[PDB]
Amino acid sequence: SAQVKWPRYLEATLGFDNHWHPAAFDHELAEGEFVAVTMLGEKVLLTRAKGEVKAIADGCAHRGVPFSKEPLCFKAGTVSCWYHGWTYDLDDGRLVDVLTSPGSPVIGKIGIKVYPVQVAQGVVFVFIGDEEPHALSEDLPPGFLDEDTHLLGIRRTVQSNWRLGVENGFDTTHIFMHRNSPWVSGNRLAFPYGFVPADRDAMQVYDENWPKGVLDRLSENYMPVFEATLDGETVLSAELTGEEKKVAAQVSVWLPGVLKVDPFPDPTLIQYEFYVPISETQHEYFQVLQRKVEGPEDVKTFEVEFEERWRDDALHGFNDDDVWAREAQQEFYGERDGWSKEQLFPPDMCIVKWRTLASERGRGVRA
Amino acid sequence: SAQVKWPRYLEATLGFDNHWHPAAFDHELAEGEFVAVTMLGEKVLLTRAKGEVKAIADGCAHRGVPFSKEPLCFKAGTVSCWYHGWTYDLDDGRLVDVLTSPGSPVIGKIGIKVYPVQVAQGVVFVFIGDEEPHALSEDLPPGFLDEDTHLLGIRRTVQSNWRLGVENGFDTTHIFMHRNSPWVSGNRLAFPYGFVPADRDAMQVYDENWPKGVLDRLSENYMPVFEATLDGETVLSAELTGEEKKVAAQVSVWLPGVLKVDPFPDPTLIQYEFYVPISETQHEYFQVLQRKVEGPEDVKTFEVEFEERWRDDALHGFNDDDVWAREAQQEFYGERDGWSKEQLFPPDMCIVKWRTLASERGRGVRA
Amino acid sequence: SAQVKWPRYLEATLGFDNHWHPAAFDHELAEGEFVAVTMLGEKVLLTRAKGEVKAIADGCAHRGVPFSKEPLCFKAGTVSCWYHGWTYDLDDGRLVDVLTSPGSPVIGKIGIKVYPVQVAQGVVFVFIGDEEPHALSEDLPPGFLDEDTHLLGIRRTVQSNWRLGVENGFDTTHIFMHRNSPWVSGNRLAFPYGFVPADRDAMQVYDENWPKGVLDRLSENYMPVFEATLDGETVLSAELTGEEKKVAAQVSVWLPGVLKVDPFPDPTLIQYEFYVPISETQHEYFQVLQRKVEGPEDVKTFEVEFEERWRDDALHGFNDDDVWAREAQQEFYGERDGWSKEQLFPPDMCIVKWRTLASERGRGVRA
Ligand code: FES
Ligand code: FES
Ligand code: FES
Ligand SMILES: [Cl-]
Ligand SMILES: [Cl-]
Ligand SMILES: [Cl-]
Ligand SMILES: [Cl-]
Ligand SMILES: [Cl-]
Ligand SMILES: [Cl-]
Ligand SMILES: [Cl-]
Ligand SMILES: [Cl-]
Ligand SMILES: [Fe+2]
Ligand SMILES: [Fe+2]
Ligand SMILES: [Fe+2]
């Protein structure tokens, strides 16, 4: 059954820890500003001190209140609790002072957790887990860190377990539900109702070193369905006329659960998606677009396109439906043991391979 | 105690299954239209295909999503899931196609549940349970199916266990709370504060074949109370003056839990009530009025009176208070084990007879 | 650990019963008026009958509905249920009549709980518990019942366990969070960021007879902190310029959990606080100000300044922040076993003494 081929995947209700996970976008943090996030059940407080983004547990060691209720900073590099003034050093999380009791004997005897942080491609990543952090590149799809590119994205909260997000991203026939998105005609896309594996090389598992993932060779080893038929009659057909754009030549997912749609939502872009667990029933959905650039002008041109088109016409215009689609599955999988009652079909094998690889390679399980 | 005289009634938190239950009104469904309902914990999707109302489980066999999120029909007699296009035959619930993968090998190897449906007197009834359906008439009070009558009603959701609804309907002294309803003077009713059993033939149990139920002979074996006294002083008195109408000559309840008030809310009408479980804490309250008719003209006259008077002046004007009355009992009975702590009095014996009959005859228990 | 030092305090999630607790203010009840309250998990109905405030269980013995849904009284000294008319004697809670069934055999054979009530200093106190009530003075801080004073207050609901309320009131360094309240400059207060115990006599435990409690001698055995320093630099300093008022010379808490701030929020006043449990996660916060008076004129002057100044400028302007401060602790202590994970420091010892005294002297534990 399910609990037999991918047990650790089913156990990772709260995600795979001992992996890097995005928390926010670098531009969300100005010097001295605070941003509260919840990752894999942990409340984290982010801030920028002396130009560097720091991550510390969003909970005071005294009476456990979150600093985010009223975040205070009286000296860059520290955070002070709004309740009794306990002050912590962001570099090591140690209690270095108590504003309400100078010289208190608890100073230097207490500390809270701080997390390793690395900002890459404008994204703030945080290492969650007890192990010492490994290279960030091991937890990202290949190409994400390309130096000759620029990235722009957004994040939002989705009311479903993170796994439903990943499986909604790495699903080659769910695209049927996007057939009426204004982005399809909006960007003159030749968009099929689904992709069906045409041979045994349709899916490739990368399990040699890191990163590890599953790749769907949509453009070479799949058959796209542009027509829907019911009992011998064509009841639906995609629009294939004139000059149309080709997207999604390949789609892949990589541990700890990051999607890569290449190219998408336009031939000149690549779309990455993360589904970071917030709680057992919620996740933070990140959408990041990657554009190849040759200099500052291309960067500026991309930023403008993102603001005027890509973001709202695609990240919302195309993907908004994916949000309620995920949430529509929450009860079944989250409450009714859908993991053992689902009935899959051929195209879902890529998802099965992902669950198997994830169950075998996820560095740490958080239930 | 309770768990000893009517144990199966106490166990039937989610209702008695293997019985017919109303789901909606026939006029709520036009050809191709969809109506989602939840009955005894089961989500059901109703539609009209080729003129006939069909009932199918509102949950896809693939990833369990409900079709009601975005119901699709590309061929009358089928329903297609909005997610990956799995299409089902409404007659048998079998998967007959997959819009995103024509000829997929799962076709014909999967199916979901469909329910027997029977429309009578403008009401859509659905058979819930594993057993094969028996005659509809066995689950309705006598007279409901009278051919020389026409029926009109409404349904609404109530936040209480269904048993609290049934017992609020089949309660001869709770009417005290309706004394100030504008319908009392609105329809010149001689309406008492309560009916107290006057002899041993006040209540009669019908437990021979079907339908089965309990009847209160209010007009001949009960004493109506038109005056409320306290410490020897008359503190309240009903208005008995001029030409007033007499209603509620008899009130009865029949398995699986259907009320019959004869006559009510007017001498020319009979009122039926159903309290179909939605969940363990909610039920769908149906109010159906029956009028004897001699032809099309009488039907039209009834439909007009219903729209202009009966529905809002009585079904709401009189009964609305019954809704919060039921919900006011939810915590006690639903959370504080009120079933074993309640303290009944003589008039409640008709309810005791009903719980006993239901516990012994309910065809199926759904906990 | 905590479970070993103050076990009964940790068990009293729903408060200490067999103690008097405030329910409302006397002026909230006019003759024949009703006020519903929930104390230590019990729903209570208050009313004034023949000039006297009465307290009866807000739940009918018949089908458990609360009278508060629609409180009825047809004879001063009784309460009648809105559902079937069961009527109870407020003096002994016995069923003395049934409006819907005169002479019903259940009359005199049924009864509900009534509570001892005592009004003092404009406050309605109710005795919760199974024991016979003891003197009210045993559950109040010394000075509360002073005959040459007048009291005025307000109450509100707070979303946190009651113990978090008490410990927030009896905390000498949490005042840091109040530094920016408009009441500080509003009443020209010389207000420190915290009070730190300066010697061994800083806290005194009164455990000889009743009332019992812990007293902090702030003005004589504590060191007030008017500056906040971080890594050697003054980052915050209170305003100490000329003619300012001195308050909080002493603060104390007494069983079952009543605070006394002397003087506060002004030198001419004393502030009392109660934190009566509503449920396991909620409490009713009472704030009562005491002013010494010499006659009806002083009473009038106090009532006027309470309305024009004390209430909104202090009870709200100063204390409102204490509400979310308490609630910010609810998850940690209420759901994440904060009682054993908290890490206290020297000033918290007064709270530790209070927990110990309460665990040893609370008359009754309600979990
Ligand atoms: S809870 Fe943070 S200093 Fe007290
Ligand atoms: S969930 Fe219905 S077709 Fe996939
Ligand atoms: S529930 Fe109060 S009289 Fe029936
Ligand atoms: Cl978040
Ligand atoms: Cl369509
Ligand atoms: Cl593990
Ligand atoms: Cl009245
Ligand atoms: Cl059974
Ligand atoms: Cl309250
Ligand atoms: Cl400040
Ligand atoms: Cl005890
Ligand atoms: Fe999608
Ligand atoms: Fe009623
Ligand atoms: Fe405070």
XYZ file of C-alpha atoms and ligand atoms in Angstrom, chain C residues 37-38 155 278 284, ligand 9:
6
model
C -22.413 35.303 33.304
C -20.095 32.308 33.046
C -15.169 44.281 33.551
C -14.768 31.878 32.252
C -13.265 38.074 33.081
Cl -18.835 36.540 31.462
